[PDB]
């Protein structure tokens, strides 16, 4: 579970993301596609080329959802219900892939928020992404 400390950390680091969330979302996807090519099996229908608008479009969607979970940090299961349903029932992404994206999101943030990406913040952001992933996978079986 996320502690008050964690919550503060997350709201703060995410606070700094601001308006770049969209671009950071797109970037985390590309990093993921390049480092863990097996994740590409879920986007057979996408143009995964560099600067793909589909990827841009998708990065924004992911970022909006994360931004929504930060806004509702005390009621994530409910704030993310719909997305939890979609993933469990339609997309059916294998659970192991959540950890891969999480990882790429952490790399992206680290690469953009050097002053904020402290050990303490890093730890909080990692527990956070793990919790989002848990929610999104909760209705799988």
């Amino acid at each position: 579970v996320l502690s008050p400390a964690d919550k503060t950390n997350v709201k703060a680091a995410w606070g700094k993301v601001g308006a770049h969330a969209g671009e950071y979302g797109a970037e985390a996807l590309e990093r993921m596609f390049l480092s863990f090519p097996t994740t590409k099996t879920y986007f057979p229908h996408f143009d995964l080329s560099h600067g793909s608008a589909q990827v841009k479009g998708h990065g924004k969607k992911v970022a909006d959802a994360l931004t929504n979970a930060v806004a509702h940090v005390d009621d994530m299961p409910n704030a993310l219900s719909a997305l939890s349903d979609l993933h469990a029932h339609k997309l059916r992404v294998d659970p192991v892939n959540f950890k891969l994206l999480s990882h790429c999101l952490l790399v992206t943030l680290a690469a953009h928020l050097p002053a904020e990406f402290t050990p303490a913040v890093h730890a909080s952001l990692d527990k956070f992404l793990a919790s989002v992933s848990t929610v999104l996978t909760s209705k799988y079986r």
Partner: protein
């Protein structure tokens, strides 16, 4: 493989007693039931709404036999699984879009089916040799992903 002559012989000898028809059908069906999300690739098979509907689905049983078939032939090239599954690796990547993680889920399901079937015969040492093969097979199949 990093199979010991002794480990090779254990694998080889139990396999000889396997009904691929039955084990293939059961392994794939169990997969679709334990890990429901693997059903995403078999929508055209029909009603997989229940264990019963999965276990009874002929399309499932027949796909299961095809898969264990190929697996079975791979046990004859245990010293080059890579070269045996190369074409199948490309197919799975480029045509089917199957996440290699699925190969690992099945492997473990396979092991549970063998234990199920052979009871006593499926000893810790025999399971150990099989775990190495399933891992080996999964790796070979995932080898050509890009």
């Amino acid at each position: 493989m990093h199979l010991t002559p002794e480990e090779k012989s254990a694998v080889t000898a139990l396999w000889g007693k396997v009904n691929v028809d039955e084990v293939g059908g059961e392994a794939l069906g169990r997969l679709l039931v334990v890990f429901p999300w693997t059903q995403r690739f078999f929508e055209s098979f029909g009603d997989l709404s229940t264990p019963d509907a999965v276990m009874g689905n002929p399309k499932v049983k027949a796909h299961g036999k095809k898969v264990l078939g190929a697996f079975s032939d791979g046990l004859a090239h245990l010293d080059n699984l890579k070269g045996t599954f190369a074409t199948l690796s490309e197919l799975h990547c480029d045509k089917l879009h199957v996440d290699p993680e699925n190969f690992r889920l099945l492997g473990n399901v396979l092991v549970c089916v063998l234990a199920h079937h052979f009871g006593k015969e499926f000893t810790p040492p025999v399971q150990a040799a099989y775990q190495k093969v399933v891992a080996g097979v999964a790796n070979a199949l995932a080898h050509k992903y890009h």
